[PDB]
Design a protein around this motif. Sequence first.
Motif, PDB file in Angstrom:
ATOM      1  N   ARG B 272       0.757  -1.002   0.142  1.00 42.06           N
ATOM      2  CA  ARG B 272      -0.003   0.243  -0.061  1.00 42.06           C
ATOM      3  C   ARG B 272       1.054   1.266   0.255  1.00 42.06           C
ATOM      4  NH1 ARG B 272      -5.163  -1.210   3.939  1.00 42.06           N
ATOM      5  NH2 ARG B 272      -5.583  -3.905   3.306  1.00 42.06           N
ATOM      6  N   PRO B 273      -0.056   2.170  -0.702  1.00 38.45           N
ATOM      7  CA  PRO B 273       1.210   3.007  -0.867  1.00 38.45           C
ATOM      8  C   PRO B 273       0.853   3.934   0.659  1.00 38.45           C
ATOM      9  CG  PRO B 273      -0.545   2.998  -2.589  1.00 38.45           C
ATOM     10  CD  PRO B 273      -0.400   2.552  -1.730  1.00 38.45           C
ATOM     11  N   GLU B 274       0.081   3.965   1.902  1.00 36.57           N
ATOM     12  CA  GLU B 274       0.734   3.894   3.150  1.00 36.57           C
ATOM     13  C   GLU B 274       1.540   3.304   3.731  1.00 36.57           C
ATOM     14  OE1 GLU B 274      -1.979   2.947   2.107  1.00 36.57           O
ATOM     15  OE2 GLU B 274      -4.197   3.906   1.543  1.00 36.57           O
ATOM     16  N   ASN B 275       2.625   3.027   3.368  1.00 35.56           N
ATOM     17  CA  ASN B 275       3.317   1.957   4.180  1.00 35.56           C
ATOM     18  C   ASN B 275       4.889   2.233   3.548  1.00 35.56           C
ATOM     19  OD1 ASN B 275       0.994  -0.773   4.038  1.00 35.56           O
ATOM     20  ND2 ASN B 275       0.609   0.532   5.201  1.00 35.56           N
ATOM     21  N   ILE B 276       4.350   3.477   2.599  1.00 41.56           N
ATOM     22  CA  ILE B 276       5.920   3.912   1.874  1.00 41.56           C
ATOM     23  C   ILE B 276       6.266   5.470   2.362  1.00 41.56           C
ATOM     24  CG2 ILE B 276       7.500   4.007   0.184  1.00 41.56           C
ATOM     25  CD1 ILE B 276       5.800   2.439  -1.929  1.00 41.56           C
ATOM     26  N   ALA B 277       7.769   5.092   2.113  1.00 38.66           N
ATOM     27  CA  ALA B 277       8.501   6.800   2.793  1.00 38.66           C
ATOM     28  C   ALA B 277       9.709   6.983   1.841  1.00 38.66           C
ATOM     29  CB  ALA B 277       9.311   5.820   4.474  1.00 38.66           C
ATOM     30  N   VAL B 317       3.695   5.965  -3.966  1.00 40.63           N
ATOM     31  CA  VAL B 317       3.169   5.983  -2.263  1.00 40.63           C
ATOM     32  C   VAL B 317       2.748   7.128  -2.107  1.00 40.63           C
ATOM     33  CG1 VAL B 317       5.348   6.957  -0.924  1.00 40.63           C
ATOM     34  CG2 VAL B 317       6.372   5.884  -2.810  1.00 40.63           C
ATOM     35  N   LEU B 318       2.942   7.185  -1.217  1.00 36.70           N
ATOM     36  CA  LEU B 318       1.256   8.217  -0.496  1.00 36.70           C
ATOM     37  C   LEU B 318       2.032   9.236   1.006  1.00 36.70           C
ATOM     38  CD1 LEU B 318      -1.382   9.057  -0.925  1.00 36.70           C
ATOM     39  CD2 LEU B 318      -1.904   7.677   0.338  1.00 36.70           C
ATOM     40  N   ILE B 319       1.826  10.730   0.912  1.00 39.51           N
ATOM     41  CA  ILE B 319       2.621  11.211   1.888  1.00 39.51           C
ATOM     42  C   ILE B 319       1.790  12.283   2.416  1.00 39.51           C
ATOM     43  CG2 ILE B 319       4.234  13.018   2.116  1.00 39.51           C
ATOM     44  CD1 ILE B 319       6.346  11.774   0.679  1.00 39.51           C
ATOM     45  N   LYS B 340       8.901  -1.025   5.134  1.00 40.72           N
ATOM     46  CA  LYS B 340       8.411  -2.330   6.266  1.00 40.72           C
ATOM     47  C   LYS B 340       8.255  -3.726   5.158  1.00 40.72           C
ATOM     48  CE  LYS B 340       7.192  -3.078  10.433  1.00 40.72           C
ATOM     49  NZ  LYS B 340       8.610  -3.207  11.088  1.00 40.72           N
ATOM     50  N   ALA B 341       9.509  -4.498   6.077  1.00 44.71           N
ATOM     51  CA  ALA B 341       9.112  -5.907   4.922  1.00 44.71           C
ATOM     52  C   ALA B 341       7.477  -6.616   4.936  1.00 44.71           C
ATOM     53  CB  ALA B 341      10.704  -6.775   5.445  1.00 44.71           C
ATOM     54  N   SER B 342       7.707  -6.311   6.631  1.00 42.86           N
ATOM     55  CA  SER B 342       5.914  -6.933   7.213  1.00 42.86           C
ATOM     56  C   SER B 342       5.097  -6.450   6.440  1.00 42.86           C
ATOM     57  CB  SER B 342       6.794  -7.148   8.759  1.00 42.86           C
ATOM     58  OG  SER B 342       6.560  -6.000   9.228  1.00 42.86           O
ATOM     59  N   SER B 343       5.089  -6.034   6.140  1.00 44.60           N
ATOM     60  CA  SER B 343       4.317  -5.149   5.269  1.00 44.60           C
ATOM     61  C   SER B 343       3.711  -4.953   3.947  1.00 44.60           C
ATOM     62  CB  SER B 343       3.919  -3.391   6.105  1.00 44.60           C
ATOM     63  OG  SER B 343       5.304  -2.976   5.440  1.00 44.60           O
TER      64      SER B 343
END
Lengths: 348, 348, 248, 248
Positions: B272-277, B317-319, B340-343
Amino acid sequence: MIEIESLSRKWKNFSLDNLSLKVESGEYFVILGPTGAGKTLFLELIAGFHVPDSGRILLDGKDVTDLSPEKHDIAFVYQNYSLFPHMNVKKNLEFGMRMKKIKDPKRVLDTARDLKIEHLLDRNPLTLSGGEQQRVALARALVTNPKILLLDEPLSALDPRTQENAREMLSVLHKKNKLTVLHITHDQTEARIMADRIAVVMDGKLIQVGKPEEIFEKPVEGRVASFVGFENVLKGRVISAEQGLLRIRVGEVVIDAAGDMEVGDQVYAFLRPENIALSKSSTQSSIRNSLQGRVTEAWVLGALVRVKVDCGVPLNVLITRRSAEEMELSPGVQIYARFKASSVHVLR
Amino acid sequence: MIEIESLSRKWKNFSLDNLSLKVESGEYFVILGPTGAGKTLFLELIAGFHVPDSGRILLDGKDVTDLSPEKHDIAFVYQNYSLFPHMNVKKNLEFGMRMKKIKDPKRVLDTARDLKIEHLLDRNPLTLSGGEQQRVALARALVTNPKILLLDEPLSALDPRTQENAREMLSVLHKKNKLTVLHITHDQTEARIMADRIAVVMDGKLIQVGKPEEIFEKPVEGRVASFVGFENVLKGRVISAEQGLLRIRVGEVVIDAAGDMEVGDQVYAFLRPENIALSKSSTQSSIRNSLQGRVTEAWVLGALVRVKVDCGVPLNVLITRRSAEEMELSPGVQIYARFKASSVHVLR
Amino acid sequence: PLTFVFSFLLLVLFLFIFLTLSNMIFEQITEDFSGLVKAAGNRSVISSIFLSLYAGFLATLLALLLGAPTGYILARFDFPGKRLVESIIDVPVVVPHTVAGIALLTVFGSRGLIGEPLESYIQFRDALPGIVVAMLFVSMPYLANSAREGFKSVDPRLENAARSLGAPLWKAFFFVTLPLSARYLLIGSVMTWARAISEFGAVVILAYYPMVGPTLIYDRFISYGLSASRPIAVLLILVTLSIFLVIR
Amino acid sequence: PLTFVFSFLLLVLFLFIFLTLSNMIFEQITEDFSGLVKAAGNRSVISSIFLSLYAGFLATLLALLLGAPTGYILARFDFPGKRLVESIIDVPVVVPHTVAGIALLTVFGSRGLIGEPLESYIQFRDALPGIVVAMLFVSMPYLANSAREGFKSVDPRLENAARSLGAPLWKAFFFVTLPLSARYLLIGSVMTWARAISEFGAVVILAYYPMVGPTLIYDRFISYGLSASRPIAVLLILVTLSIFLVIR
């Protein structure tokens, strides 16, 4: 107001054994766990549609276990608001009145206002939407002005679009009527958001009881932990809300998130363990949130590794077992819990 | 094999106007969009249970639009596998045979093997589970050995626990029978994972057609983009899998994630875009994944800000809008996409 | 293919019934239209009809008074003999007409269970109450099964909802349950009334004489043959269709 | 409260029906048990029963042959006259028994539509085929409505599924639809057979004489009074319950 004393009843699929509870006046008590068949019946037995096998039921301190529904003098709103289809809204409201022989049209026009139904007062039950019906429901259910309001699954079955308001409507009636509400749901998130207390009942068995915080941040073994384990929900208060971006306060820390809410709003922020990271340092990422604190416990799981961190706010983080070894499992290592702001869902 | 020529039919709730499609032999074509009422009928019309108002239907190159189901010589498996309850599995399989007057018990025992049903061959349809039934279904549906296999919602209605296998079973039949499958679903994720092509149909209207990649990484305006916008699904190949932790390859980059899969497995990773930084640097966090690349486009939204980054792999990505200003919206800034890998959820 | 054969056989049945009841009227309004005009004034006839409608209207008010609650009961509760009680109610449509008469006589007859000990208050045989009781025994099931499905229709919750609002069971049943099941009770009553009006065998045995519409037609048929017979049967139907149709 | 009143009225109905049919048997197996023993050998009686079961079994095979497809049709299709066609089929249970006889006579009578032009092949009045046709007209609806709900029960998809597997409509209907709707057809046939066996008025007018069980009981009743009357009515029921119960 509501006291269940050693209750027990046996049906063809639901079994209730030794149930004891005390919901004190004005308290918004919530039973959590059961699925349909159960919920609805447990509540019906309270309302007096089913006499127990053993035990008592004491509303307002009156032993009613062997009385009738009309005598229990309650407010009852099924999940599927059972409005009478051959009576325009108003006629419905009236019903309760005509039934106990009362006069005041003020109570009726005022009750109608309290639930914002004045404009529908004339329409016929079938042209109304969920809420419209639900309101009308609560309306007539609360015209006799009882103190005890028994509700079942009033929320989980609505468009998310109404849930927010819906929750308010209720919270509001809870106070402005000084109601003692008994709320039964299978939605733990609903349970949290509106409980004064939760009563966990699994397979018709009372298992735990107590304020929200006590139920999730301190489950009882196996059953309860499995039902609500590892979930980050932070009750906070919005301090700033400039341009859709909120800044919410939890305990002593500040969290950045998003949503339309005004300052001073007691809100809820959901944060999954898989959206929190852990560095031995805070860099300037797109990451709005980054909190200090140490590790509490390390639950080595399968491929992943649960971790409880204390950043002024208890947080449940999840990590790949491998990163958990490259870093330190040491229960007390200084840590930086950083989680993306756009992954924090906020509710009110 | 399957060609719909200027098709159009009008029912009481579904409208089909000017539909043209060409599914070439052996191709696993997938129609995406419609909900129940539609899907099931569109397929029924193909199978010949509904004559159109205008247009043609050409299976194997035969104009069948005005023929009968028995003559269309197809394989049809409703969502709720319509097994005949008064015939043990075997008897069902047989049916197709006895119907077209065939002899070979090899085809039957072999078909029964192909779907791993030998052990159920004797049981009665009602004691079988979803898959068990579904297999038996595909079994008899494919004993007459047609080339064209029409399936409707074969997946979305199963325990996730079977979906993985289920998908295989099908992919397998697709080849080992050299089938030309027409798959209709409302699950885009299912669509991706198994299509050779997707045919987007909204409210009985063909809107787009083409290989998966073309449908999601290149939608047509409004409707399509809204239906599948901003989702990271990376088709990759597992390179290493030591102790539950996978290392998957996408294009030219490597992604760490988790799940039981063996090396050489063509898998799917949802992100998900909300899990990328996004950092202007990669630090050593508990973050397994951290990729270089520049920014492509900046979609200033409400409080959040969509961003397309190119890290050898297109990533959405979402910011928070605010971080988007503290950093640079410059379409081309060097960047580090860290998630994160677990996401990262992986499917096969 | 199959659709055809099936459709032919069906067209058959349709004609079979339709032509029969049609034809019969055709004759009358053809070879002797006047016969009707005669029947119309004939007291023997008018008295036999008004009687049927009358006896019937009554048997229905009993059916209403018994079938209705038997429905409310059967649609809400579950006891040990639901199966039995449920079948006895069903039976009366398979008890050969005659049989029912005999059987009924055995009870309301001057020498029967209830008829013997009640010679002073009311007489049954060859009297009105005799035909009334006969009809009831044969038409009651209709208003029952129909009033059951009526009440079954209105789901419990509404009753429970009214209850908790402060309404006693009957107030509940009266202000809610009932009014909502009306459409069903209305049909069932009328269906009853018509199963009554049309009862022959059953009534003949107990009270053949105050000559009920259907009996009359039979009397005439043997004595004065088919001529003074048809005109009454045609006049009777038109009344059934006028009632049946002024409501269904 | 309400439950009580309602439950009382119900207990009433129950007894009303139960006691009536019971009582009637009570008498027989009480004051003249022998009467039965006599009836049992009496040819007049045995011939009247075997006749009923016979005529009936036949009317049912016609009902089966017509009601069945009328059901399959009515449960799958929707045409313009579904309402009408659907009502004509329903009607025969409100056409007063007598009336139906008269009407029927008008067609199968030596001077009727179908009876007149068929004097050489088959005779109807006072003959077997006369009673057969009578029964059918009165019991057919049952096997129809019952075979409709039967077919309605089996959902379309199964037929469509068989079709696409290579089965023509009838093979579909035969190997699937039918076998699955059996339980319904079986009941309906038997329900029919029993609505037939018990038909009086309707048959009397067309073919009173080969004396069908129910008619016989009436004949005896007037002539030799209630004594030689009851023993036949009791003997008849026992046969109805024997049948009705060897299957429901």
